[PDB]
Design an enzyme around this catalytic site. Structure first.
Site, mmCIF file in Angstrom:
data_model
loop_
_atom_site.group_PDB
_atom_site.id
_atom_site.type_symbol
_atom_site.label_atom_id
_atom_site.label_comp_id
_atom_site.label_asym_id
_atom_site.label_seq_id
_atom_site.Cartn_x
_atom_site.Cartn_y
_atom_site.Cartn_z
ATOM 1 N N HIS A 14 12.488 13.327 -40.454
ATOM 2 C CA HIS A 14 12.139 13.512 -39.060
ATOM 3 C C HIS A 14 12.353 14.947 -38.604
ATOM 4 C CE1 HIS A 14 11.703 9.117 -38.086
ATOM 5 N NE2 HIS A 14 12.378 9.045 -39.221
ATOM 6 N N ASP A 113 10.755 13.093 -31.157
ATOM 7 C CA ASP A 113 10.423 12.006 -32.059
ATOM 8 C C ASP A 113 10.047 10.763 -31.269
ATOM 9 O OD1 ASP A 113 10.884 9.714 -34.072
ATOM 10 O OD2 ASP A 113 11.115 11.576 -35.248
#
Ligand SMILES: O=c1ccn([C@@H]2O[C@H](COP(=O)(O)OP(=O)(O)O)[C@@H](O)[C@H]2O)c(=O)[nH]1
EC number: 2.4.1.-
Length: 443
Positions: A14, A113
């Site tokens: 991520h 995210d």
């Protein structure tokens, strides 16, 4: 002058795309602040052009997240905890920064995210636009939003080899593997989708020619504008590595003939039996191909790293290491194939470097990626039935040497060419990035 604040999830798969995106946006003239946990922080000295602000787990660390393991499956409990309890602190930190803003400086947006669904209401409350970075594929999302049809058919409630009635592109066995954990992850998943739909824009790490079948689903299901940008084609994620690279591998790669090496890696958090680990190993030794294996310490269950392996077992043709600059390895002329766990960054990196794949999976989006890559794009072979020394050997040789695998190798070269063309002027990724910059600038 305009600043963008980006807030990644603190895990390798991520952090990598969000800091590639940050660099792309910096190259387009935005200043960059990164909000990040202290946990799993990248090396801030690699990013002199970014300002880092560490949040949410500063000492004194909270009773809800203090004590949490820094490694393993339980380390991910930080995600639901921060979603549930981090809103007040995130708002304070955003407001502090918006306050200290230079007179001629404005914060254009917050990019998070998708997993940080809690940030939507925080951004709203500040009149701050939030965009979302998806770290998984459009196809995976299409599969997400199709779960109701899946649920009715009992696919989610444990005829494995037939095509799903909703999804011709998938087998029932794929869906069962992808959504094995529906009670546990279902809540996070729904809220992530809801707040992604409610965001001001969605950035996908992909390109139109990779997932053309999926564009219409994203246009129909997400009212916010979507942008597809293949981040590995802009830059590698070398600078956001959370582990030290073993660069001694490139001297060894330089001793191998072109396209002769199998690169093997199962990602940043997968783990395997002591049994499976030694079967894979025999499968590699059996294929008779040279290989460079990345085995993460703890990848093996019961062993600190690779103790079950007899001294010299890999022999002449194999090398095992702990960590490499993966995309740079995939770009080396010695690499002929990549045996991957089908994580989305790894899959896209391989696509972007023109390397055909052998696929294994450990659930979640991975079986979907392997199915799409292997049966739609046809850039790899899917080992969809466990670890057998025999079957492994044939798949490796089929991709790397067999004349019968030539179409897979050619498909990988052509698909890399499509990725490259897409960044050219008039290409789909060029136009999507152009649209994204002008859109953010209008905010
Ligand atoms: O030896 C390694 C193994 C992996 N990676 C990087 O780690 C990330 C892994 O992300 P992915 O989505 O493939 O899978 P995950 O590890 O999250 O399951 C990718 O960017 C890889 O290039 C790396 O730099 N060196």
């Amino acid at each position: 002058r305009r600043r963008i604040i980006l807030f990644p999830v603190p895990f390798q798969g991520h952090i990598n795309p969000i800091l590639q995106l940050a660099n792309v946006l910096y190259s387009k003239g935005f200043s960059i602040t990164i909000f990040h946990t202290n946990f799993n922080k990248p090396k801030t000295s690699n990013y002199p052009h970014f300002t880092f602000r560490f949040i949410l787990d500063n000492d004194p660390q909270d009773e809800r997240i203090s004590n949490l393991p820094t490694h393993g499956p339980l380390a991910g409990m930080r995600i639901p905890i921060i979603n549930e309890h981090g809103a007040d602190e995130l708002r304070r930190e955003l407001e502090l920064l918006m306050l200290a803003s230079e007179e001629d400086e404005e914060v254009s947006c917050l990019i998070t995210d998708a997993l940080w669904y809690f940030a939507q209401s925080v951004a709203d409350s500040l009149n701050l636009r939030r965009l979302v970075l998806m770290t998984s594929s459009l196809f995976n999302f299409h599969a997400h939003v199709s779960l109701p049809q899946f649920d009715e058919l009992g696919y989610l409630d444990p005829r494995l080899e037939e095509q799903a009635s909703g999804f011709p592109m998938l087998k029932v066995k794929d869906i069962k593997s992808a959504y094995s954990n529906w009670q546990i992850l279902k809540e996070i998943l729904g809220k992530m989708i809801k707040q992604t739909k409610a965001s001001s824009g969605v950035i996908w790490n992909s390109f139109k020619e990779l997932e053309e079948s999926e564009l219409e689903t994203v246009i129909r299901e997400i009212p916010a504008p979507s942008f597809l940008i293949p981040l590995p084609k802009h830059l590698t994620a070398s600078s956001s590595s959370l582990l030290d690279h073993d660069r001694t591998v490139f001297q060894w790669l330089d001793q191998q003939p072109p396209s002769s090496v199998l690169y093997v890696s199962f990602g940043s958090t997968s783990e395997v039996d002591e049994k499976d680990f030694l079967e894979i190993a025999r499968g590699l030794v059996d294929s008779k191909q040279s290989f460079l294996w990345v085995v993460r310490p703890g990848f093996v269950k019961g062993s600190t790293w690779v103790e079950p392996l007899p001294d010299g077992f890999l022999g002449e043709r194999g090398r095992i290491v702990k960590w490499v600059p993966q995309q740079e390895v995939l770009a080396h002329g010695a690499i002929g194939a990549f045996w991957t766990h089908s994580g989305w960054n790894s899959t896209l990196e391989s696509v972007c470097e023109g390397v055909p794949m052998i696929f294994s999976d450990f659930g979640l989006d991975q079986p979907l990626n392997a199915r799409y890559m292997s049966d739609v794009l046809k850039v790899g072979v899917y080992l969809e039935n466990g670890w057998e020394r025999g079957e492994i050997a044939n798949a490796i040789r089929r991709v790397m040497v067999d004349e019968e695998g030539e179409y897979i190798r050619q498909n990988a070269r052509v698909l890399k060419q499509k990725a490259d063309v897409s960044l050219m002027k008039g290409g789909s990724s060029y136009e999507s990035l152009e649209s994204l910059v002008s859109y953010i600038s209008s905010l």
